[PDB]
Design a protein around this nucleic acid. Structure first.
Lengths: 110, 48, 103, 26, 117
RNA sequence: CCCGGCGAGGGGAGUGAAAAAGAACCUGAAACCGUGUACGUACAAGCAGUGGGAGCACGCUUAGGCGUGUGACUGCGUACC
RNA sequence: GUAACGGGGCUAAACCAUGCACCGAAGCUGCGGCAGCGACGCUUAUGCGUUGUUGGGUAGGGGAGCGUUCUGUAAGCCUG
């Protein structure tokens, strides 16, 4: 059985989030949680919250027994960007991009 | 004797040139004016 | 056993019960064809002939189908001289089935 | 809340430089 | 009266980009680069359609030379003898026989040598 | 109803012909960015293709063999306006 | 940086004279296909046959076409 949780419009660049994503691709959830517990990155918190939500979804809606789940799929996409202005010397102006991302995690008893 | 059965006489409806519409037409890219000079300019020429 | 003959300005090497592709022949799809000229016959011993056309050898075959080959493309181009041109082509052919090789 | 708006500024530049000697001067 | 170029342009661009599959990098993604790539491929195909025949005749001659020297005579004298004996077998068939039939080729060599001497 | 900060975002349930019509809402192309599968790649020198060509994978086939994808090695070859 | 045979190498694989073979181009020939221009016949008009010959191309001249959006034929025809 497949269960999905998502986080959309997360405030972080996708390149920075992809580094944490592949640390847990294909692991059992029990060890993935404690791996995410001891990485000193901002994105680890977001990924951990998404993973816990997915586990809760799988346990409540569909069948139980979180003791046999694995991380089957996980990927990060790019969301919309916000544009701002930063002044530079001699009266020039520059464009600043504030990038976001979407996070998807799939867990499965199989 | 129908509105979709009439046709003009042959050799009576020649087409007309269209300049600057590709290589195959034989008239693209300067459309028959040659290279630079007074006569190739827009509005160029000499009196009678 | 195999033999050598020439049909379309080219030469071929065939044996019994084998299908060949030739240039177009003006022959109906059903009937058979004859090839009087033969340059060589071989089975254990080689009846090859000094003068061409081994004297009493013929090859029997009948036509299977006509058709056209796959399309090829012709492109001509000249650098910075305002010129290019294109064209297509398919080639007719005929298939025959070898039925009998007589020494 | 959760609705964002902005604008732009395009005054470009105001040249007048190359205070060093000419490249292949007189 | 007013005509929009929306659909025809897309059709042409897709037509060009379809026959650029497998090319490396931007040569299979971007229209400007793909067009030049396709034109150059056409020119190369036209030229190689003629180079092919030269290459194959060269290969046939090399194989025939090897076999003839195996039987004790060089290529030039071999085909001179075959001409003097009035044999019309061409080089493709000769190379095929040399590879696939060692006895018929020896018979041909004997005949050419007899005619030459 | 459940996870979460009495969040933001999700997963169910329900409405509807349709929610991949959910308010960032008809249809939704391209550049650009990802995950998965097959093949190639760590002794090899250049407009990156074209002619020749093993091996591997998949599908059909009654062998015969075809079709699709990839492409070791090799001849020729200095973009466009 | 060998650096004044393209290299390897060569005492003939160098030079002179004579001779016979072979290789070698999109040239020529063989096989299949297309188009232009003539001449001669048939239709005795479109056209259809017999042949002969031609088909590299910028500036430029001449001749035939494809596709797009609107009006008529359209209260027709296609389409939940």
């Amino acid at each position: 059985m497949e269960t999905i949780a998502k986080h959309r419009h997360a405030r972080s660049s996708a390149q920075k989030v992809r580094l944490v994503a592949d640390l847990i691709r294909g692991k059992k959830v029990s060890q993935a949680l404690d791996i995410l517990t001891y990485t000193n990155k901002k994105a680890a918190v977001l990924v951990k919250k998404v993973l816990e939500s997915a586990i809760a979804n799988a346990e409540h809606n569909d069948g139980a027994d979180i003791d046999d789940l694995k991380v089957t799929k996980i990927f990060v996409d790019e969301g919309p960007s916000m544009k701002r202005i930063m002044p530079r010397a001699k009266g020039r102006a520059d464009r600043i991009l504030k990038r976001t991302s979407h996070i998807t995690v799939v867990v499965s008893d199989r | 004797m129908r509105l979709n059965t009439l046709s003009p006489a042959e050799g009576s409806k020649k087409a007309g040139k269209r300049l600057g519409r590709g290589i195959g037409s034989g008239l693209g890219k300067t459309g028959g004016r040659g290279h630079k000079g007074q006569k190739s300019r827009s509005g160029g020429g000499v009196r009678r | 056993m195999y033999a050598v003959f020439q049909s379309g300005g080219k030469q071929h090497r065939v044996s019994e019960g084998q299908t060949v592709r030739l240039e177009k022949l003006d022959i109906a799809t059903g009937e058979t064809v004859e090839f009087a000229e033969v340059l060589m016959i071989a089975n254990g011993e080689e009846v090859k002939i000094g003068v061409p056309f081994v004297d009493g050898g013929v090859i029997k075959a009948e036509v299977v189908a006509h058709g056209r080959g796959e399309k090829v493309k012709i492109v001509k181009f000249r650098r910075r001289k305002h010129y290019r041109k294109q064209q297509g082509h398919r080639q007719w052919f005929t298939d025959v089935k070898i039925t009998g090789i007589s020494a | 809340v959760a609705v964002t708006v902005y604008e732009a500024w395009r005054q470009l530049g105001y040249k007048g430089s190359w205070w060093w000697p000419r490249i292949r001067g007189p | 009266a007013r005509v929009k170029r929306g659909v025809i342009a897309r059709a042409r661009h897709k037509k060009i980009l379809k026959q650029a599959k497998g090319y490396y990098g931007a040569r299979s993604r971007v229209y400007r680069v793909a067009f030049q790539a396709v034109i150059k491929a056409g020119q190369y195909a036209y030229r190689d359609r003629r180079q092919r025949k030269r290459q194959f005749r060269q290969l046939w001659i090399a194989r025939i030379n090897a076999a003839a020297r195996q039987n004790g005579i060089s290529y030039s004298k071999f085909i001179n003898g075959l001409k003097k004996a009035s044999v019309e077998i061409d080089r493709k068939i000769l190379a095929d026989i040399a590879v696939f039939d060692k006895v018929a080729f020896t018979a041909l060599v004997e005949k050419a040598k007899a005619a030459l001497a």
